[PDB]
Amino acid sequence: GMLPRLCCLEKGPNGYGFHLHGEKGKLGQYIRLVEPGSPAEKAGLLAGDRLVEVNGENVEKETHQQVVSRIRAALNAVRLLVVDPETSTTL
């Protein structure tokens, strides 16, 4: 499939089960630490992924805090459009 993976997560009793990290010298936010047995894993999320959209909005050039706020404000379900940074570049 040529489209980016779209991971559709429903929040569980222990949250979504992943970490989000920025470095800022790098473009945008990255997935880390996808806990075994979590909504994140069931949805197909993988640590190393670069996060491109949250619920249909591009988050590549937003601050870490902005992206976290978007995710937290959503009503307990999020669709994360993600790419493999090794093979994917924003120009």
The one-character DSSP state at 71 is H
Pick one of 11, 55, 68, 79: the residue that binds Cl ion (CB under 5 A).
55
Q: Does 58 bind Cl ion (CB under 5 A)?
A: no
Q: Does 61 bind Cl ion (CB under 5 A)?
A: no
Q: Does 32 bind Cl ion (CB under 5 A)?
A: yes
Q: Does 84 bind Cl ion (CB under 5 A)?
A: yes
Q: CA 85: distance to chain centroid?
A: 13
* Inter-residue long-range contacts of 63-72, CB under 8 Å, 24+ positions, other chains counted: 63/22, 64/20, 64/21, 64/22, 64/24, 64/29, 67/20, 67/22, 67/28, 67/29, 68/20, 71/16, 71/20
With CB under 5 A as the rule, give the number of residues binding Cl ion.
9
Q: Which stretch binds Cl ion (CB under 5 A): 9-17, 41-49, 65-73, 77-85?
A: 77-85
Q: Does 90 bind Cl ion (CB under 5 A)?
A: yes
Which residues make up the interface to Cl ion (CB under 5 A)? 19, 21, 27, 32, 55, 83-84, 89-90
